[PDB]
Every structure is written in structure tokens, then in C-alpha cells.
Design an enzyme around this catalytic site. Structure first.
Site, PDB file in Angstrom:
ATOM      1  CD  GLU C  38      40.963  34.063  36.659  1.00 40.22           C
ATOM      2  OE1 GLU C  38      41.442  34.939  35.896  1.00 40.22           O
ATOM      3  OE2 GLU C  38      41.575  33.568  37.626  1.00 40.22           O
ATOM      4  NE  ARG C  42      41.253  33.042  45.016  1.00 41.03           N
ATOM      5  CZ  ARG C  42      41.481  34.349  45.106  1.00 41.03           C
ATOM      6  NH1 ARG C  42      41.052  35.024  46.174  1.00 41.03           N
ATOM      7  NH2 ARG C  42      42.126  34.987  44.132  1.00 41.03           N
ATOM      8  CB  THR C  64      42.418  29.170  42.079  1.00 43.29           C
ATOM      9  OG1 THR C  64      42.005  30.548  42.078  1.00 43.29           O
ATOM     10  CG2 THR C  64      43.309  28.913  43.288  1.00 43.29           C
ATOM     11  CE  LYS C 124      44.616  35.490  34.556  1.00 38.86           C
ATOM     12  NZ  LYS C 124      43.877  36.020  35.727  1.00 38.86           N
TER      13      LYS C 124
END
Lengths: 195, 197, 197
Positions: C38, C42, C64, C124
Site C-alpha cells: 500500500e 499523503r 489515504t 480495513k
């Protein structure tokens, strides 16, 4: 929100009768805390907002449960609104009246919903029971555009840990307001030192 | 409608695996002043247990409700109230239509508010122990004083003293009560009532 | 869709800062039987890293993810699956349209039920360690047995033994695996596999 950011502390007052409200206001201002949250747990809350209206403080109304209640708080003297969880209709009222609304959130899904309502300064509540420092550390990385106001069970022992967080608007709580005015001075100074 | 839960103070949770003495259990619970029992729908033995217990004298709850259709099945099998792990708006609709209590699980203040908006003020708090139930519910006692909570999830004897002081409990729920034979169940119920005093 | 994650048992999380040996890392991960990675979004560096890894043999996730448009940018850069911190219904729509897996972060039972209503059953759990991951997931194993979870957030070696025993894990995710040079990555991956076994 500049006042809150400047102050770094948001004392939370539940009014039970007998409090020296204007004495409190003067002390807080002297100690560089320019904001106070008055809880709406009783009808005494609205009266206290009215009594403090002209004190110089940025007044928040807490435990807001509805848009009608929000509006009553604003008419009593509140300059910003705070609710335990996210209330979209209170967000609508606040936006209509041009006042800040800090909804309580906890989970990342809730943070996203608040953002979608245009809200980026959020209460994190109840902070201590939900591991606030460690959660907010996680959130600093994934929600870097959000500033949080953790409230709930915060005490002196926890302050050093919050101090290192990059994403705090302010730390909120009732612990600052236990005891006489002398005690409030000491707790406010101690808190700023620990932060 | 939940006067029974409130007087009982305890809501034992039974996941049925086969071979349980259901009628003996109902007898024991009633003798010990626990007038309600939640039967989980973790498998289809749960519906058969509700039917078996229909006329035992207990207020029967169906747990792990996941849909309106499953809720309706539980009511037809003999459940008097419905419990789900989280908040299910359509289950609330079904319960309201059918005039039965629905105790949805909530955790966060935003979830408490959403439940209140659906006219629900007796709520499950789940899973209670992993999410710091006593301290959370202590906070909610102040901000949501119109709400009564039924914490469930990982509750054990060690935790009961701390729940005892809470002003806002409808009841404490869990499977710890129903471990062992009937003599054990008597002891665990009596101990729990004592620790909750 | 996520057989690779399931066989891997681990999902290393990389926040790219510049300088990383991405192709060397991809080679090591594959050698060590970890077929997925992953890449957090960011910053803009994340998209660049996906492009750099596009044909490395890894099943690439974009983390994200904050919007459908960002999701789409991630897929165009070479992501094979999408991960967000919380549940974003419009990202789910984009993912289903593009025929790619979306693993939304959830924490509470209400959030699990909402993800399930979107057809999502591999979720998740984030942030896992601050929200008592092992004990929460243990409760969810019973009440949501059709759901597989990918806990992420503050996971470290010390926590792995307790996750190992969960029957409802898709994989354990985190950045701890990627602290250090490539030999350290090798050691941390082997250690993690042993602790999860």
C-alpha cells in the site's frame, strides 16, 4: 478560532448556581485564556451565557442537541457552538448565522462526514476514554488539514502527551475549573506549562 | 416495555449450540429474579430456541439481528424485543410498525444522536469492554442523560463493580452469566446482582 | 480479488518521502512471499511511486484515498485496489464502476453494517491499535462472521501474537515492516510471518 488557538485551552463550565462568573471571566482573561465553553446541561447554562455576554470572553455553548437549542444559545450570547456528536442540521444553522460549529467526532468516517459539511475544526469527544492522544496522532498523518479540540476526561496527567501533537486547536475540559479563583489561576498556568 | 430488563438489571446472552437445557435455564433465571434472556441469531438454532422458550415466562430478546426480514422472523418465533450490533434504521422501522422495543448497538455520540432521532432512547453499547464502557458511559451520563444504555461485549465479574456506580444503565448484558451448569448459573447471577449493588 | 493479500497475510504500508529504493523493495517483498504493497497518498510523491512500481509484480494499493477523483488518479497511476481511512460511499461507487476492490476503514458495528450495505465485506479496521483492535475484532468475528478485516494503525511486532489467533483477518497492515534498509525489511517480514503463525 484564533482566540482558541491562541489560548490553547478551552475551559468547560457546567453551571450549578453560585459561581462567580464575572470573577472567572476576569481571571481567565488575565491568564491569557480568552474563551469559555458553557454547557447546556441545565437551563442555568443559558442564563450564564447572558450574564457573561459582555465579559470579553469568546463564549461557546456546549452540549447543543438541536438547531432550536443552538439558536437559543446564540441569542443568549454564544459566539460558537459545540455538540457531543455530528449534527448536520446544527451545521446548517451555524453556517446560516455565520458562527463556528465544532461538532464532536471520533471515527475516521465521522471526520470525513464533518469535512463534507465544510467543517475542519472538530471536537474529539470523549477524548480520554477513546485513547485521544494515540488516535489524534494517527489523524495528524491522514487528516493533516483538520484541527482537533479533544475534550472528555482530560486531566493534568495527560497534558504532556497532548503537547507533542501537531494538529491541536486547543485542549478542553472541566478540570481547569475545579476550586476557587486562586485554584483556577494555578491550573491554567500549570496546563500551559505542561502543554 | 423494558421494566423487566430494568428490574432484572442483567440480560444474559445465550448463543445456542445444541443440548442446552433451555426450560431448566428459564426456570432458574426466573427463580433468581432475571426475567429476560437474549438469544443470539448467530445460527439457525437461535430461532428454534426462541420457539422452544415462547411460553417459558421470560421476556425474550433476539440478538445479532442483521435485517428487517430476520427481525420479523425472530418476532414470529417468539421474540419480544430486538437487538442489533449497530444501528439499523430499517429494523427500527420494522420494530416501530410492530410495536416492539428495538435496542440498537451504538458506540459514538454521533451514533447516539442518530438513534435518538429515530425515537430510540434505550440503546445497547457494544462492544462495551473493548471500547472502555464504564468511562464512556460515565461521560454519556452527563451529556445524554435522557438515554439508558445496555452495555454488552466482554463483560465479566471483574468489571461489574465499576458499572454499578453508573446512573444511566438499563441493564448489563453478556454471556459470562451462562457459563457452566445450572448451579453455576445461579451462583453467577447472585454474584452479579451483589457486585452491581 | 484479494487472494494475494490473503496469502501474504501482511500489507506493508509505505509513505514515500524521496530516496526510497522502490524496485529493490518490491523485489525483496516478492522474495519474502509478500505480493502486495500500500502506497499512501499523503503527498504527490505517492502517485509518482505508484507509476514507478506499476509493473513490478506487486498488487499495488493506494491508501489515504479521500475522494472519487483522487481514487481515479490512483488507479490511472497503477493502483490495483483502493483504501480509505473511513467509509466513503462515492469512492465505493467509483471502485465498483472500475471493477476494483475498495477496502474502506471502519471502526464501529454501525459502520460495518453500512459498508456491508454497499456490498463491501473486506474492510480495513483503522486505527487498529488505539481502538483495541484484537479485542474488537474478536467480538466482530462472532457477530460479523462474513466479514474479513485488515487492521492497520499502530501495529508493531509486540501486537502480532494476539492478532495471529483471529479467524477473521484478511491481513495485518502497517509501516513497521518498512522501517530500515532492505535487510531489515527482510528480517521484519520473516519475524511478522513467524509471529502470525
Amino acid at each position: 478560532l484564533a482566540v482558541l488557538a491562541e489560548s490553547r485551552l478551552l475551559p468547560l463550565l457546567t453551571v450549578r448556581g453560585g459561581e462567580d462568573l464575572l470573577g472567572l471571566a476576569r481571571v481567565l482573561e488575565e491568564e491569557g485564556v480568552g474563551a469559555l465553553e458553557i454547557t447546556l446541561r441545565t437551563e442555568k447554562g443559558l442564563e450564564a451565557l447572558k450574564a457573561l455576554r459582555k465579559s470579553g470572553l469568546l463564549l461557546g455553548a456546549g452540549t447543543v442537541r438541536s438547531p432550536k437549542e443552538a439558536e437559543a444559545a446564540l441569542e443568549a450570547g454564544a459566539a460558537f457552538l459545540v455538540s457531543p456528536g455530528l449534527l448536520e442540521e446544527v451545521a446548517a444553522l451555524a453556517q446560516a448565522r455565520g458562527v463556528p460549529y465544532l461538532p464532536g467526532v471520533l471515527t475516521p468516517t465521522e471526520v470525513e462526514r464533518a469535512l463534507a459539511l465544510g467543517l475542519s475544526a472538530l471536537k474529539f469527544f470523549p477524548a480520554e476514554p477513546f485513547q485521544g492522544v494515540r488516535v489524534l496522532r494517527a489523524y495528524a498523518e491522514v487528516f493533516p488539514e483538520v484541527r482537533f479540540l479533544p475534550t472528555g476526561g482530560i486531566k493534568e496527567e495527560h497534558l504532556p502527551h497532548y503537547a507533542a501533537l501537531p494538529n491541536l486547536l486547543a485542549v478542553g475540559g472541566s478540570w481547569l475549573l475545579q476550586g476557587n479563583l486562586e485554584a483556577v489561576r494555578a491550573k491554567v498556568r500549570a496546563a500551559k506549562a505542561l502543554l
